[PDB]
Amino acid sequence: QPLNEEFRPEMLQGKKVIVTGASKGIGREMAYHLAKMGAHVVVTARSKETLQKVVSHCLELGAASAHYIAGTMEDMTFAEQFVAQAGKLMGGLDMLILNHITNTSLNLFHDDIHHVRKSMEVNFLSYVVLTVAALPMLKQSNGSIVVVSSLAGKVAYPMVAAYSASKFALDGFFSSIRKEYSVSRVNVSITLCVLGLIDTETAMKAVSGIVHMQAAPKEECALEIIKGGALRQEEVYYDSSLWTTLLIRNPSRKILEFLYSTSYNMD
Amino acid sequence: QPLNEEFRPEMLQGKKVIVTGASKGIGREMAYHLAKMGAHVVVTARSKETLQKVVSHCLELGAASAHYIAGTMEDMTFAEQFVAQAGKLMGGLDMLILNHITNTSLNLFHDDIHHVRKSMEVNFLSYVVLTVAALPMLKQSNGSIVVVSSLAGKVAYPMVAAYSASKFALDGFFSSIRKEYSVSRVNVSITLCVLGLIDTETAMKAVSGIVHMQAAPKEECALEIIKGGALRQEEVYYDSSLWTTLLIRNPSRKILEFLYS
Numbered sequence: 001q002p003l004n005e006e007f008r009p010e011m012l013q014g015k016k017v018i019v020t021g022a023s024k025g026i027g028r029e030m031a032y033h034l035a036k037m038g039a040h041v042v043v044t045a046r047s048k049e050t051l052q053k054v055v056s057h058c059l060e061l062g063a064a065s066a067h068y069i070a071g072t073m074e075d076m077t078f079a080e081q082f083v084a085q086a087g088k089l090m091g092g093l094d095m096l097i098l099n100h101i102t103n104t105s106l107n108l109f110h111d112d113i114h115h116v117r118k119s120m121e122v123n124f125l126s127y128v129v130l131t132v133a134a135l136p137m138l139k140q141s142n143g144s145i146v147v148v149s150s151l152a153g154k155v156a157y158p159m160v161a162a163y164s165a166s167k168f169a170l171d172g173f174f175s176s177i178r179k180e181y182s183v184s185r186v187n188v189s190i191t192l193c194v195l196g197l198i199d200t201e202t203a204m205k206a207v208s209g210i211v212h213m214q215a216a217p218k219e220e221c222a223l224e225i226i227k228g229g230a231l232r233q234e235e236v237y238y239d240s241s242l243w244t245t246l247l248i249r250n251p252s253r254k255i256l257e258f259l260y261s262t263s264y265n266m267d
Numbered sequence: 268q269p270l271n272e273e274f275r276p277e278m279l280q281g282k283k284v285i286v287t288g289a290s291k292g293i294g295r296e297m298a299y300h301l302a303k304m305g306a307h308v309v310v311t312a313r314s315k316e317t318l319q320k321v322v323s324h325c326l327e328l329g330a331a332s333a334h335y336i337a338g339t340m341e342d343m344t345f346a347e348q349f350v351a352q353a354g355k356l357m358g359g360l361d362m363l364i365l366n367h368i369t370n371t372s373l374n375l376f377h378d379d380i381h382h383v384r385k386s387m388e389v390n391f392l393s394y395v396v397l398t399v400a401a402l403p404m405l406k407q408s409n410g411s412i413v414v415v416s417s418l419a420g421k422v423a424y425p426m427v428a429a430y431s432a433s434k435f436a437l438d439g440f441f442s443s444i445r446k447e448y449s450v451s452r453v454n455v456s457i458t459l460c461v462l463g464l465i466d467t468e469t470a471m472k473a474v475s476g477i478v479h480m481q482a483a484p485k486e487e488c489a490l491e492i493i494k495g496g497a498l499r500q501e502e503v504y505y506d507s508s509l510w511t512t513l514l515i516r517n518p519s520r521k522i523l524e525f526l527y528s
């Protein structure tokens with residue numbers, strides 16, 4: 001149910017935002033941009049050193065407030081406790097950016113069922129848990145979920161099966177939740193971010209002698225995600241290219257869903 | 268260039284506007300809307316008797332001027348001169364609604380080059396003369412050009428082949444000048460209007476024994492043409508089974524041109 005305005009940094013001033021996987025990469029960048037914009041901000045990841053740093057820049061950059069809570073999203077207790085603790089810290093919640101992911105490498109699949117389950121737990125199941133926990137507050141602010149996904153979450157890829165599965169799962173889970181929200185008269189927006197290669201310490205570390213693509217700036221990536229969510233869009237596409245950024249849209253799907261939109265009109 | 272704005276009937280009034288093939292069906296309706304919204308309206312067609320019917324109903328509906336001219340658009344001399352005459356009769360021009368077509372019926376194309384030629388003359392070539400004559404005045408007003416087309420102008424259908432050819436012609440031509448303008452700083456607006464079956468007499472006689480879904484009303488259609496016309500949209504769809512309205516769109520093509528530009 002996209003917005004009908006144009007983005008302005010002020011849409012975020014005074015907004016209370018959680019960003020996860022917020023200690024390096026895109027997550028960091030989002031915190032900073034929300035900082036420049038004068039938002040309350042709660043950030044998270046496992047290492048508390050690195051998080052402190054981020055919290056510093058954020059306060060220097062302009063945040064109405066800025067905290068951090070360290071912990072693994074491997075553990076679901078923390079996930080549901082983090083949310084309750086963070087909505088306390090800022091006194092309520094406007095947007096929830098689900099961004100974190102478990103350490104992955106590019107490698108062929110030969111029997112790593114530990115990695116597959118782990119991907120599923122951290123990259124997918126935690127999202128749902130956090131969303132469950134944030135939903136009450138989100139309702140009462142008419143906030144917004146943002147979810148960060150990938151090419152590999154829309155099309156297949158050899159080096160990253162466990163990761164793809166997890167990303168694909170988000171699409172299916174949240175898109176199918178997005179429907180429920182419409183009919184539910186639930187006024188919380190769900191934005192899915194599909195990204196091509198992005199220049200992160202980590203991404204490069206894992207691709208820099210295998211993949212040939214040009215990667216996009218982490219800084220701009222982050223802003224497009226904040227905006228997409230601010231403008232309550234359904235998908236955000238971002239890739240150095242524009243060939244790609246136009247293909248991942250799948251209108252067959254737009255249709256079929258529109259069609260099957262009226263195979264039922266019952267509660 | 269798009270516009271996320273919204274349509275109020277007031278975007279019109281005071282606007283200088285031509286409506287071709289107004290003597291019947293959708294043309295009549297477009298004008299009757301422009302009259303119930305009151306702009307300057309010069310209206311063409313051949314039938315002089317019916318082009319009077321229309322010219323007066325428009326006054327008694329609130330047009331800030333109604334006049335007719337009566338000729339056959341087969342005549343490229345006439346066409347160029349109609350747009351002069353109407354240019355004078357109005358002191359400028361904002362919106363040109365190319366709509367006229369030529370007598371067709373469903374028929375399996377055997378060997379009738381004649382119908383193919385007339386179709387290209389009246390349905391494609393003339394609209395091109397109308398435009399070229401109109402272009403100075405529309406430059407001076409940052410106006411809009413509205414081209415009316417059809418399903419048969421996007422995808423193949425049997426039985427209307429002369430037709431489709433002239434319709435497809437309109438797309439290649441106008442979408443291609445459209446681009447010429449943008450990458451040029453020329454602020455003229457070109458709308459292609461892709462319309463499924465509509466409920467009009469000459470269009471009902473023709474499709475007689477063809478299992479169509481109900482033709483959507485000439486009125487909202489006419490309105491739709493005018494709306495997106497005014498809204499300066501690149502293209503405008505409209506079909507009764509609004510189903511179609513979805514996949515009639517061709518996203519595949521959008522991608523291509525973006526890159527070549």
Ligand SMILES: NC(=O)c1ccc[n+]([C@@H]2O[C@H](COP(=O)([O-])OP(=O)(O)OC[C@H]3O[C@@H](n4cnc5c(N)ncnc54)[C@H](OP(=O)(O)O)[C@@H]3O)[C@@H](O)[C@H]2O)c1
Nearest residue numbers: 021023024025026045046047072073150197198200202203
């Ligand atoms: N960069 C790209 O080319 C690209 C392309 C498509 C999609 N994406 C998506 O963008 C998002 C972020 O990616 P990125 O490139 O910024 O990667 P990144 O730099 O490696 O982000 C890692 C973040 O997640 C945290 N994290 C890792 N394991 C965790 C765990 N078990 N529990 C809680 N937090 C954990 C890390 O913190 P700690 O390790 O300190 O806990 C760090 O804050 C991901 O959703 C990714 O799929 C990126």
Ligand SMILES: NC(=O)c1ccc[n+]([C@@H]2O[C@H](COP(=O)([O-])OP(=O)(O)OC[C@H]3O[C@@H](n4cnc5c(N)ncnc54)[C@H](OP(=O)(O)O)[C@@H]3O)[C@@H](O)[C@H]2O)c1
Nearest residue numbers: 288289290291292293312313314339340367417465469470
């Ligand atoms: N009706 C549909 O089912 C439908 C569906 C798809 C597309 N369309 C499109 O809608 C547009 C208008 O269709 P319509 O249904 O409104 O058609 P229509 O009812 O037959 O009207 C045709 C108009 O064109 C005029 N005309 C015929 N020959 C002419 C000529 N040689 N020079 C100048 N004007 C001439 C007629 O006036 P005179 O007889 O007085 O000359 C009449 O005003 C066309 O582009 C058509 O392709 C309609």
Ligand SMILES: C[C@](O)(c1ccc(S(=O)(=O)c2ccc(C#N)cc2CCF)cc1)C(F)(F)F
Nearest residue numbers: 104150151152157195196197202203206211213
């Ligand atoms: C988490 C990780 O950083 C990652 C980055 C990028 C994507 S991607 O789906 O966007 C992507 C984009 C472009 C291309 C190309 N050529 C390939 C991919 C798959 C990955 F190699 C997936 C995952 C990594 F590298 F696996 F560790």
Ligand SMILES: C[C@](O)(c1ccc(S(=O)(=O)c2ccc(C#N)cc2CCF)cc1)C(F)(F)F
Nearest residue numbers: 371417418419424462463464469470473474479
């Ligand atoms: C000019 C005319 O009125 C006309 C109307 C409709 C279209 S159409 O291409 O848009 C169309 C629309 C719906 C369906 C369906 N079912 C079929 C068609 C093709 C026609 F057989 C083409 C032309 C006619 F019929 F030829 F006189």
